[PDB]
Amino acid sequence: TTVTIVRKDGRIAIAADTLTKWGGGKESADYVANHEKIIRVGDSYVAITGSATFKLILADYFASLDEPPQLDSVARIFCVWNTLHGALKEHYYLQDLESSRMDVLIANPRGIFGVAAHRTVQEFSKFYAYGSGSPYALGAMYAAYRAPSLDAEAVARLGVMAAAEFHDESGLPVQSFVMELSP
Amino acid sequence: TTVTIVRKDGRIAIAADTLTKWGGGKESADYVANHEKIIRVGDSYVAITGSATFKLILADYFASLDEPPQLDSVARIFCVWNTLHGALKEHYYLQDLESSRMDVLIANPRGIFGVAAHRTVQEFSKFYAYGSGSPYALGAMYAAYRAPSLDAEAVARLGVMAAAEFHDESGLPVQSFVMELSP
């Protein structure tokens, strides 16, 4: 998987590839209808790496809360995730600090963030990428970020394309979303 | 085992081989009366790979519910399976995410689906196959899917035949079912 996230010129964008792997087996978007790796949670988008099951777990989990959570600051995302982890264990059969086994990027109008598998929550200032395709994507976005003709979404997508070009766990098409930074 | 599932021209079909293995031992349909690997659960068909015991466990489990479950969307199948997993552990002596140790395909008139051992639920758009024979089947169905003289059921069965031709864990005859896609 490759997932990317970019913040540039008053816009925020998030992107992901669409290939599912089962061993060396490829399950492309052409065979799998529900190939999207980004889900909506409130006005945030959450792009997921890790087992494919986590897409559905998070969707079910967040759906089950009274209202959707605020995912717009580092401390907030941290609480949400610390609670989540307990639920992954009590309800969803997950097995130094314990790992939640997934890395996600979170985009909303108030900022761009990431949560890594040991609940390290980071806020990003320009761009970032998670997933095994991540270094290819970082290189591509490093090259393209200051290109004046490429908006935040172009750069996010370019990151995913680069990973799909060279790595056997990422595949086109790219799914992406874009939003205005709030004031 | 090979199990296959196909959706083509307003019809949906599901198929399986009939060979049981015990080590290198072969227990063909000719010696085992209850050799069918597909079970009915409501108006869905469920084709099972894994331990032969799971055929009976699912039958017993689904039988024991108030009514049979809706297995016609990805989120629904997911809840059903997450609950099931708990029951495999509490009643039926099953031992990153925990594994349910079975892969199944699910066919009903609203769509074709799969659930893999770590509860990854997928909806398929054309065809797919699970089981150790699966790649042989995928190749055969890739070659035959657009043949205009082969309906969904022919393609499903052809997948199983291909696996039985070349792999020692699959065996003829092929058991299959077909239904109309709903509107």
Partner: peptide, 4 residues
């Protein structure tokens, strides 16, 4: 073991 189906991965993203």
């Amino acid at each position: 073991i189906i991965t993203x």
